[PDB]
């Protein structure tokens, strides 16, 4: 959990600047005390200070799992998932894939935007 | 671990020796007998097999799914580049968390680049 609330609060200072307890316990589906014991967790581990500003070492964390995210839709989307599909099963892989495989991905997903033939010729394949 | 874990190692130990033996599944999943017995025990309820250990019609369908699915998935990573030793714990971590609908895509995927290997060097080159 701990990478899906940085991801969170990542993206909500993106969107509005900061990250509230509250919006970051509606975003995740949980009860804002579950926030509060996490939030002192990312403080521990120096990944957040005191509202809620993110170290140098929780932004990369947090830039990166933005990264992942987009990247793994983008995938699934390419290769013709349905897009009500995509979220859920991004949300549901993304954080159990090697470095690795996210950077082949990366390449393949390259791979596809770099001529729009081969997009044709999966299709085909479909 | 999951339901699906479990039918899939009862499954491939049953086509390895054509029994699935409590000890061998704990040993497989790394798990106490304990977690077994009363996975065991839901899995018969749920009507996916019966006590040894027998697949119903329903569990062998499944059990046969999952090591495709197992097997596509390491075919996936495997044409797209990822470092083989990485592959066998990512598939762990993805297979029971993909829609059948990206699994099928991800087949088809699997079958582009197998049907012209001019594709596979293709990709080679962007990397
Ligand atoms: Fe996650
Ligand atoms: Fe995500
Ligand atoms: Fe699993
Ligand atoms: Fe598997």
Redesign the pocket.
């Known amino acids: 959990s701990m990478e899906?609330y940085i991801?969170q609060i990542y993206m909500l200072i993106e969107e509005k600047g900061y990250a509230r307890v509250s919006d970051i316990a509606e975003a995740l589906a949980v009860h804002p005390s579950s926030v509060t014991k996490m939030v002192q967790k990312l403080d521990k581990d120096e990944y957040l200070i005191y509202g809620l500003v993110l170290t140098s070492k929780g932004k990369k964390i947090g830039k990166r799992?933005?990264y992942?995210?987009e990247l793994?839709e983008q995938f699934l989307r390419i290769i013709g998932v349905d897009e009500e599909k995509i979220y859920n099963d991004?949300?549901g892989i993304?954080?159990h894939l090697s470095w690795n495989s996210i950077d082949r991905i990366g390449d393949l997903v390259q791979y596809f935007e770099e001529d729009d033939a081969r997009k044709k010729d999966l299709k085909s394949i479909q």
Do not use: N, S, T
Request: cysteine-free.
């Open positions: 899906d991801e799992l933005v992942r995210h793994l991004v949300e993304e954080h």
